[PDB]
Amino acid sequence: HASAIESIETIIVDLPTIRPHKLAMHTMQNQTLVLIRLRCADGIEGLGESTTIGGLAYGNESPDSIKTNIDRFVAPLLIGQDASNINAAMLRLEQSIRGNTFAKSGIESALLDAQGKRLGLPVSELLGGRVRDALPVAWTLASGDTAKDIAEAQKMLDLRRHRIFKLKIGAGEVDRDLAHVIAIKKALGDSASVRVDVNQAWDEAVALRACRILGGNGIDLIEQPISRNNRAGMVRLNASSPAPIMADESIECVEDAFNLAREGAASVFALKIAKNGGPRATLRTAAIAEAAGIGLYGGTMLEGGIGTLASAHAFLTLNKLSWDTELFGPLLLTEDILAEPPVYRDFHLHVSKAPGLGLSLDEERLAFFRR
Amino acid sequence: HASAIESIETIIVDLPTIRPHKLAMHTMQNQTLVLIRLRCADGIEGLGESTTIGGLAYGNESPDSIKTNIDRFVAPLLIGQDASNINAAMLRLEQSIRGNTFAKSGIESALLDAQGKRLGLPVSELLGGRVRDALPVAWTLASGDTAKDIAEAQKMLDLRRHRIFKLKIGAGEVDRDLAHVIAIKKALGDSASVRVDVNQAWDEAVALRACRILGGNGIDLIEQPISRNNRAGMVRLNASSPAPIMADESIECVEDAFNLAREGAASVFALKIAKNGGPRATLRTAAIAEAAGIGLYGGTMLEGGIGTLASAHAFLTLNKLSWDTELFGPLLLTEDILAEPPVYRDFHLHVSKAPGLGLSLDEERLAFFRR
Numbered sequence: 001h002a003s004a005i006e007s008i009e010t011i012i013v014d015l016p017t018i019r020p021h022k023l024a025m026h027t028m029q030n031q032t033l034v035l036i037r038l039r040c041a042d043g044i045e046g047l048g049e050s051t052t053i054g055g056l057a058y059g060n061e062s063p064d065s066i067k068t069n070i071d072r073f074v075a076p077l078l079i080g081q082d083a084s085n086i087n088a089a090m091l092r093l094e095q096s097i098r099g100n101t102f103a104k105s106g107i108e109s110a111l112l113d114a115q116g117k118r119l120g121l122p123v124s125e126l127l128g129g130r131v132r133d134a135l136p137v138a139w140t141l142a143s144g145d146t147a148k149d150i151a152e153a154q155k156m157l158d159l160r161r162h163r164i165f166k167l168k169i170g171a172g173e174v175d176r177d178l179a180h181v182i183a184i185k186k187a188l189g190d191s192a193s194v195r196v197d198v199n200q201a202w203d204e205a206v207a208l209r210a211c212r213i214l215g216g217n218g219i220d221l222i223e224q225p226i227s228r229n230n231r232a233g234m235v236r237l238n239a240s241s242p243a244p245i246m247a248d249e250s251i252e253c254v255e256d257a258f259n260l261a262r263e264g265a266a267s268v269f270a271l272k273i274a275k276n277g278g279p280r281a282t283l284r285t286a287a288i289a290e291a292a293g294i295g296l297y298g299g300t301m302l303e304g305g306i307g308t309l310a311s312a313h314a315f316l317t318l319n320k321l322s323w324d325t326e327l328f329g330p331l332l333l334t335e336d337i338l339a340e341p342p343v344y345r346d347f348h349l350h351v352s353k354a355p356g357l358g359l360s361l362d363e364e365r366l367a368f369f370r371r
Numbered sequence: 372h373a374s375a376i377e378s379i380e381t382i383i384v385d386l387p388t389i390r391p392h393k394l395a396m397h398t399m400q401n402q403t404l405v406l407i408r409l410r411c412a413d414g415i416e417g418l419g420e421s422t423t424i425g426g427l428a429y430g431n432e433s434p435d436s437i438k439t440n441i442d443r444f445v446a447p448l449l450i451g452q453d454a455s456n457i458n459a460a461m462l463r464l465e466q467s468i469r470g471n472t473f474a475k476s477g478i479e480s481a482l483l484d485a486q487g488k489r490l491g492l493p494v495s496e497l498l499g500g501r502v503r504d505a506l507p508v509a510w511t512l513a514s515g516d517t518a519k520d521i522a523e524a525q526k527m528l529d530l531r532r533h534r535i536f537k538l539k540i541g542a543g544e545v546d547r548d549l550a551h552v553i554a555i556k557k558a559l560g561d562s563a564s565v566r567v568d569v570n571q572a573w574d575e576a577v578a579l580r581a582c583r584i585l586g587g588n589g590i591d592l593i594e595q596p597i598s599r600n601n602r603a604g605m606v607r608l609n610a611s612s613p614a615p616i617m618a619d620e621s622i623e624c625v626e627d628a629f630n631l632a633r634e635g636a637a638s639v640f641a642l643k644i645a646k647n648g649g650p651r652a653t654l655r656t657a658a659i660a661e662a663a664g665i666g667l668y669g670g671t672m673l674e675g676g677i678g679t680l681a682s683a684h685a686f687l688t689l690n691k692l693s694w695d696t697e698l699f700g701p702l703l704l705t706e707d708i709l710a711e712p713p714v715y716r717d718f719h720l721h722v723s724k725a726p727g728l729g730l731s732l733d734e735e736r737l738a739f740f741r742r
């Protein structure tokens with residue numbers, strides 16, 4: 001085919017971050033991305049990104065295993081295939097490859113980037129058409145220090161960078177974390193929306209009390225308080241919690257989204273291209289959530305500019321993202337591999353109408369930071 | 372510690388098989404294993420095996436990615452740790468590594484082999500004590516030809532090799548697969564037990580009819596008829612099916628076993644060390660099943676001698692394996708990496724009382740077959 005895929009290269013890139021990021025199960029000291037370079041016969045290159053958090057501390061795919069499985073299994077399946085038919089290509093992968101959503105996400109992003117360049121349309125238009133050009137962006141407070149978090153939040157407010165804050169908790173004693181969260185909300189007052197993310201750290205026995213306390217103290221959303229394995233517990237917590245609960249880790253594929261909606265496991269769903277298998281699969285998850293009356297949140301796995309924009313282009317097509325987004329990945333990184341970084345200002349990420357993902361590689365930065 | 376782990380080597384080995392093995396989603400032409408060689412400071416080496424089917428066509432871990440994740444993440448966590456405290460070592464892995472059960476299974480198998488040699492006890496005794504020395508072994512008919520399958524079954528029966536047969540279906544038109552299964556049962560009659568495995572291939576709409584037909588035609592068990600994602604459907608099928616349904620792919624961790632039991636998704640559970648994370652994790656899944664009144668089946672991912680014996684030692688401790696086992700993996704291989712293959716005779720696999728997994732590596736064959 002004229003647009004036949006000729007090569008697929010995966011490159012692991014290590015990048016520095018602005019400060020340590022403490023999750024309930026891991027403290028990030030930096031970040032690693034997997035770049036996908038997909039070239040077609042018509043002389044078009046598509047760029048994609050597969051990124052996770054803390055090696056295998058967060059999910060089952062590591063930057064390393066992602067490269068291994070793409071090179072050994074994905075590449076052989078797609079080389080020679082028509083890059084202009086994205087649906088056919090991704091379904092071809094799905095029939096021979098189980099799981100590996102992070103890898104699939106990077107591959108589809110690259111195909112979409114290439115296809116956008118091929119038609120001279122931004123990805124958002126390939127996906128149906130945008131209903132907005134800007135997306136609100138929340139910021140995560142996870143320095144591990146209450147005073148430091150409050151100061152950072154106030155700074156983002158003064159600089160008009162962010163006004164929605166996500167607090168990582170679950171690593172310490174419950175009462176200590178709650179006091180931490182309550183203190184932050186008290187200091188910010190109505191100037192900001194404060195939410196928490198427990199990353200599955202609590203047992204239901206602890207969450208049933210903690211959620212009641214958070215809800216009574218102005219916390220707007222409680223993300224994945226307990227293990228995705230306590231299916232019945234998540235349902236029960238939705239009933240006892242005066243604050244809405246959001247599913248994140250509970251969604252590891254589109255089918256999970258349906259089952260959670262069926263069971264009533266959460267009233268808000270985080271949307272992550274890495275967890276669903278790309279922008280298109282993520283839109284199927286959003287469609288399921290919308291059909292069920294579940295709120296949407298534009299999530300991230302802390303990707304750099306490529307993965308962040310691949311996510312953004314999908315979110316631009318959604319009628320409503322009631323809980324906003326957390327597309328701040330490129331801002332947590334002190335360095336990326338793009339010639340120009342995504343555009344952030346006045347609490348939002350502004351997406352251009354340039355072809356594909358509207359970005360270009362900084363060959364020099366890539367060559368320097370690539371592993 | 373005197374038993375500190377000093378090194379962990381992972382070796383991918385490609386071995387030849389006796390014939391094409393046709394699964395609903397993939398046809399095997401040979402088998403690939405990942406050998407784990409774990410050496411301790413006290414001069415003891417433990418051997419383990421992590422094996423899957425068809426690259427990524429069956430699960431999210433490939434022999435390739437298993438080696439990558441063990442070398443890059445598991446090794447660093449374990450080198451220096453006391454090899455004689457298996458529980459502490461595996462929990463150490465669990466707190467930093469999500470998923471990767473196939474990899475974990477190989478690691479724990481190696482640790483068990485080493486600890487068995489260290490104490491001069493077979494792995495079955497380390498796990499509490501065996502209640503039998505032999506395990507009944509079923510045989511999978513998957514040549515893709517009715518006449519050939521019947522002939523092979525008749526050969527295995529008359530050789531007193533196997534009298535329980537598992538038929539893989541789901542790759543063809545439903546009525547064609549049903550005719551195939553029924554023809555086989557009709558040819559063997561009461562001399563053998565015939566069961567099927569659909570590997571999630573059917574939609575519930577198809578299964579609700581197909582299960583009734585199979586149950587009305589002498590088929591004893593229906594393994595994973597539909598997708599593990601149709602949770603509500605598996606429950607509904609248990610009610611309409613006159614033949615018991617066994618969960619296999621639905622179990623990808625111990626927690627899944629609990630949820631399936633809670634929901635009533637199957638009346639029999641397949642037990643696979645690769646799906647649970649090793650012999651010990653599999654015994655926890657077995658405990659959950661027993662506590663729920665669910666039948667047990669000794670499953671396999673077509674492991675060679677090492678993985679099969681690691682599985683066998685755990686199954687020897689179970690009070691009852693109502694649905695027997697399918698530990699025939701070594702019989703599918705024309706050459707393995709064990710000095711002496713497992714002992715099969717009179718419809719059973721006979722396990723010795725030798726220390727550890729009671730086996731010795733065939734260094735010559737390892738050197739010849741390794742990548």
Ligand SMILES: O=C(O)C[C@H]1C=CC(=O)O1
Pocket residue numbers: 053140197199248300301302326
């Ligand atoms: O929250 C997660 O599970 C993943 C990621 C999103 C932002 C962040 O701080 O971590």
Ligand SMILES: O=C(O)C[C@H]1C=CC(=O)O1
Pocket residue numbers: 511568570619671672673697
């Ligand atoms: O069936 C499976 O799921 C895995 C394995 C067990 C025997 C066999 O033929 O394949």
Ligand SMILES: [Mg+2]
Pocket residue numbers: 197199223224248249
């Ligand atoms: Mg989260």
Ligand SMILES: [Mg+2]
Pocket residue numbers: 568570594595619620
């Ligand atoms: Mg099976």
